[PDB]
Amino acid sequence: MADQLTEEQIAEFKEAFSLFDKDGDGTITTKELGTVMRSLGQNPTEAELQDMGTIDFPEFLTMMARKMKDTDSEEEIREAFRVFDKDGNGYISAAELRHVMTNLGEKLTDEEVDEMIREADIDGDGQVNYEEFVQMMTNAAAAKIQASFRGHMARKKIKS
């Protein structure tokens, strides 16, 4: 899993991490976690209360790598939503939303498009702020979107 990380990233993380190895050695306490990440360049907020009483170095390398992955695919889905934002005002009408989902990619079906709508912030004129939708879900493009929404729907119903 650290295999996903570059040798420079691994040194970067060794250093940062060891700087807060003010001992009990090989471990940092979870309180210093916020700080370590910032002494890099992350500014997390509560995605950081979710992140996991001390973290050892392999699991820090792990969280870090899992986070690169957590952000790349975030970008990938915002990318997809951009492809479909006619003018780029950061918005997509529910109608445009319904049209591409059902018409491109692994075509969803209208019953499974309605629930891709209810959850999202209210009908801002029929418009949809898709960023408040990427932050919720956490051609080929519709497929990246469609695949993710499914993953989001898998998560919600995994409760019951």
Curated annotation (Swiss-Prot):
Residues at which Ca(2+) 4 binds: 121, 123, 125, 127, 132
Modified residues (N6-methyllysine): 107
Cross-link (Glycyl lysine isopeptide (Lys-Gly) (interchain with G-Cter in ubiquitin)): 22
SMART domains, sorted: EFh
Single Gene Ontology BP annotation: response to corticosterone
Swiss-Prot/TrEMBL keywords: Acetylation, Calcium, Cell projection, Cilium, Cytoplasm, Cytoskeleton, Flagellum, Isopeptide bond, Metal-binding, Methylation, Phosphoprotein, Repeat, Ubl conjugation
Modified residues (Phosphoserine): 73, 93
Residues reported to bind Ca(2+) 1: 21, 23, 25, 27, 32
UniProt modification remark: Ubiquitination results in a strongly decreased activity. Phosphorylation results in a decreased activity.
Binding positions (Ca(2+) 2): 54, 59
Pfam family, one: EF-hand_7
Note: This protein has four functional calcium-binding sites.
Role according to the record: Calmodulin acts as part of a calcium signal transduction pathway by mediating the control of a large number of enzymes, ion channels, aquaporins and other proteins through calcium-binding. Calcium-binding is required for the activation of calmodulin. Among the enzymes to be stimulated by the calmodulin-calcium complex are a number of protein kinases, such as myosin light-chain kinases and calmodulin-dependent protein kinase type II (CaMK2), and phosphatases.
Domain notes: The N-terminal and C-terminal lobes of CALM bind to the C-terminus of KCNQ1 in a clamp-like conformation. Binding of CALM C-terminus to KCNQ1 is calcium-independent but is essential for assembly of the structure. Binding of CALM N-terminus to KCNQ1 is calcium-dependent and regulates electrophysiological activity of the channel. The C-lobe interacts with KCNN4 channels in a calcium-independent manner, whereas the N-lobe interacts with the S4-S5 linker of KCNN4 in a calcium-dependent manner playing a role as calcium sensor and gating the channel.
Name the record gives this protein: Calmodulin-1
Upper taxonomic lineage: Eukaryota, Metazoa, Chordata, Craniata, Vertebrata
Gene name per UniProt: Calm1
